[PDB]
């Protein structure tokens, strides 16, 4: 009955400046064995769990070496040398010890240069019509940082309740956020109207951007 | 490749049993022993249940009475047999190899997992998706596939079967109000390489035997 504690919850690192995270045990993690039972476990978004650290500052077969892990007896420390856009995702630590408990998982994110986003629309499918619902969509492809602003306007006059929003995890590679944005209603209600407007706000912009499509 | 491969996730009403297996490649599942971790949707993990290589298991406390892990080496094959479902169980569920043997002494970390299969616990009977096309600006042009309404959690989509890799974003599913889930996959293509190209997504909602492709032409 072992507790793991793991802080802090979330990190936003510049690439290639240090990061730590720390695990500490609710009772100490060393063995007869001269051993400390911890592992560190890394899980990149949409993968399983994959193995980094184990006994505390094992590296494991094809981890980079900028992932060293370190610390004993009821503390220990996963250290990333220097950060790179590949590493962004939840890590987790586990004692196996009794019985196989995980910290909660410091999720890692990536401090980029500002991006603005590519913005892009698309109109209600032939077939969705044809069936009598009328879905909008609005992309913002590749942005950072998360923080985006999707404004729905129909006929320019606003638009509040009838849309949701999806945001991608951070990219690995150009550490990107993605977004898609769903303006949903009846059609009926759909061809009341003929102006339809996405409008988007971002730190990376100077004026809230407005691609757009009428009826 | 060492590596473990799922298979047969699933919905069921509570109460309901189901059984999960894996599939191992280049190393054999006697030889180690074998463990499940969970993962509820937007939790972190939770180990489940291990399998030692003298046949014995051990299990965590959310679980003992209702779950048996058991391997068939002739397969070699894991399997996990869950009984006896509630909406607690509901979550991704990950087999994976532990690299490990406490009748000797060395502990090489669990270092081989499957892809994670997935269980829905509820009563709701399956609902599947349809999949709407979603057809185009700069140098480069965007394009993408709706597949919307459907229950439960998740869906597989991929671009001309996993020929396109580069430049896709699958989205996280939304919750309707009307109980259904709906997702938008889309991908950044060169303007340049206009619609004289074929591009079908391949949309695949396990829980019902619905498995489609489309063109998405403007």
């Known amino acids: 009955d072992i507790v793991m504690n793991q802080s802090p919850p979330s990190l936003a690192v510049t690439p290639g400046e240090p990061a730590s995270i720390s695990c500490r045990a609710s009772?100490?993690?060393?063995?007869?064995?001269?051993?400390?039972?911890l592992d560190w476990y890394l899980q990149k978004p949409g993968q399983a769990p994959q193995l980094l650290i184990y006994?505390?500052?094992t590296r494991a077969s094809g981890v980079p070496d900028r992932f060293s892990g370190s610390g004993s007896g009821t503390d220990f420390t996963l250290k990333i040398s220097r950060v790179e856009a590949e590493d962004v995702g939840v890590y987790y630590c586990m004692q196996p010890l009794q019985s196989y408990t995980f910290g909660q998982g410091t999720k890692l994110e990536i401090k980029r240069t500002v991006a603005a986003p590519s913005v892009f629309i698309f109109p209600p499918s032939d077939e969705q019509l044809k069936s009598g619902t009328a879905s909008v969509v609005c992309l913002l492809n590749n942005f950072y940082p998360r923080e985006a602003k999707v404004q729905w306007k129909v006929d320019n006059a606003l638009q509040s309740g009838n849309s949701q929003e999806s945001v991608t995890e951070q990219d690995s590679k150009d550490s990107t956020y993605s977004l898609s944005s769903t303006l949903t209603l009846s059609k009926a209600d759909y061809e009341k109207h003929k102006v339809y407007a996405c409008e988007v706000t971002h730190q990376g912009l100077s004026s809230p951007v407005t691609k757009s499509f009428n009826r | 490749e060492v590596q473990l491969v799922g298979s047969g996730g699933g919905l069921i009403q509570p109460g309901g049993s189901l059984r999960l297996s894996c599939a191992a490649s280049?190393?054999?599942?006697?030889?180690?022993?074998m463990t499940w971790v969970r993962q509820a949707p937007g939790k972190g993990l939770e180990w489940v249940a291990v399998?030692?290589?003298?046949?014995?298991?051990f299990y965590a406390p959310s679980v003992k009475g209702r779950f048996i892990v058991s391997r068939d080496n002739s397969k070699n094959s894991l399997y996990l047999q869950m009984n006896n479902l509630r909406g607690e169980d509901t979550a991704v569920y990950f087999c994976?190899?532990?690299?490990?043997?406490?009748?000797?002494?060395?502990?090489?970390?669990?270092?081989?997992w499957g892809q994670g299969t997935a269980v829905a616990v509820s009563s709701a009977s399956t609902k599947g998706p349809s999949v709407f096309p979603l057809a185009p600006s700069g140098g480069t042009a965007a394009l993408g596939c709706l597949v919307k309404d459907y229950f439960p959690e998740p869906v597989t989509v991929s671009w001309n079967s996993g020929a396109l890799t580069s430049s896709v974003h699958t989205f996280p599913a939304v919750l309707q109000s009307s109980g259904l889930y709906s997702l938008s996959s889309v991908v950044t293509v060169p303007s340049s390489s206009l619609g004289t190209q074929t591009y079908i997504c391949n949309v695949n909602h396990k829980p019902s035997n619905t498995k489609v492709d489309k063109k998405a032409e403007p």
């Open positions: 399998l030692y290589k003298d046949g014995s298991q």
């Open positions: 994976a190899r532990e690299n490990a043997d406490y009748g000797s002494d060395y502990y090489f970390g669990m270092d081989v």
């Open positions: 280049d190393f054999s599942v006697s030889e180690y022993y």
């Open positions: 009772q100490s993690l060393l063995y007869s064995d001269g051993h400390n039972y």
């Open positions: 006994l505390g500052s």
